[PDB]
Ligand binder design. Structure first.
Ligand code: Q9P
Ligand code: Q9P
Ligand code: K
Ligand code: K
Lengths: 215, 215
């Protein structure tokens, strides 16, 4: 209990558009707040939108903190990381554009993060996805490989994430997707099987789909 | 001109639900029919739905043929393959659940199919997608690889596709995704860059999205 620090990434933005009267960002916010494992939520957002979360501070059973967003997603993660409780055993990074994450799936990725050191929610990729080289040719592999689409939460022990940022900074390495920093480390990353309902709200068509799932 | 045979895969089914009053399957059907390169369309469908396509035979400037569907998608491809003109230089396989394919993108993949021998429409995968091993761990690769989501058409020289089917049959090989048969061959497969609008209609949420794009 109260071992986990959540970093909620929320930096006309899509994550503040209402679903059934509630801004998208508040759905995951409340899901995390109800979990006894969660001690605190560090919301990374433009100071303009702080009131959206601040309104519920005494109602929720977590500490609320804020951090300023950065230029890219990993900079926002780093900013949030500076505000967590010094004794938190686990950091739980979530895209606020994913409002429909199930408590049960958060529980799973928290467990796996604790066990392995780093874990992320994923689902099997349904489409035919292939590696393509610089001459636009399919890179053929009869060595079979199952591909998974990553979601959030991404759950990691704070010291491991900090070492990841330190390595990328010191050596000046390229950050290209949402698990690139840990990919440079030798520490394993577990993929916790999530739900296809945990969609990211990018456009008004997702905005619509999110609302159906809520029904 | 008239060098291409289209195999249109259409076997309460999703591909016969109307978009703006026209069954989904007819959209790609008509797109192909207007192209001078296309000589014929072999529709693979349950005999029950033949009338949907048969209604327009004298109106369209292509030959119309039919083939019975098989158990899996590759069996339907094989059935359609048996009906093409004996002198067709190119077979153009299309999922009828993709009604929004642009003529310009069909032209591109036809060109690339002719040049390379095998080509497929694709777009860069937007999500973070990773290989995951049997212990549910991310298979790390600092050797960077750009992943692409495959669409249709899949365009191939008939003799190459036939050799692919012959190899899979003779050796009893596993067909696991929509490009597995050519993956066993040494012949290259080109990925022609398509459009994100060329979506597959799997559910009523796609059914809705397809209709927006049409507006
Ligand atoms: O490596 C990371 C992590 C860390 C992490 C934690 C758990 C599983 C997998 C990756 C995060 Cl939160 N954000 C990131 N953005 C780019 N890279 N990158
Ligand atoms: O290999 C294939 C092809 C052939 C092809 C043609 C052009 C590009 C890539 C693959 C087709 Cl149409 N369908 C398939 N279903 C399973 N495998 N498989
Ligand atoms: K989307
Ligand atoms: K879909």
């Amino acid at each position: 209990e109260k071992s986990v620090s959540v970093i909620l990434l929320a930096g006309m933005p899509k994550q503040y558009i209402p679903l059934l009267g509630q801004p998208i960002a508040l759905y995951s916010f409340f899901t995390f707040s109800r979990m006894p494992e969660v001690k605190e939520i560090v919301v990374v957002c433009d100071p303009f939108f702080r009131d959206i979360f601040e309104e519920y501070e005494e109602s929720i059973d977590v500490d609320l903190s804020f951090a300023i967003p950065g230029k890219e997603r990993q900079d926002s993660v780093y900013s949030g990381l500076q505000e967590i409780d010094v004794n938190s055993e686990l950091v739980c990074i979530h895209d606020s554009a994913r409002p429909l994450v199930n408590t049960e799936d958060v529980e799973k990725v928290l467990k796996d993060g604790s066990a392995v050191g780093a874990a992320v929610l994923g689902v099997p990729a349904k489409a035919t996805i292939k590696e393509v080289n610089s001459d636009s040719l399919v890179v053929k592999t009869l060595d079979r490989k199952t591909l998974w689409e990553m979601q959030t939460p991404q759950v990691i022990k704070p010291e491991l994430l900090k070492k990841g940022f330190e390595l990328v900074k010191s050596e000046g390495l390229a950050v290209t997707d949402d698990v690139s920093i840990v990919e440079y480390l030798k520490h394993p990353v577990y993929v916790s099987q999530g739900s296809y309902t945990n969609i990211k709200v990018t456009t008004p068509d997702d905005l619509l789909l999110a609302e159906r799932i809520l029904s």
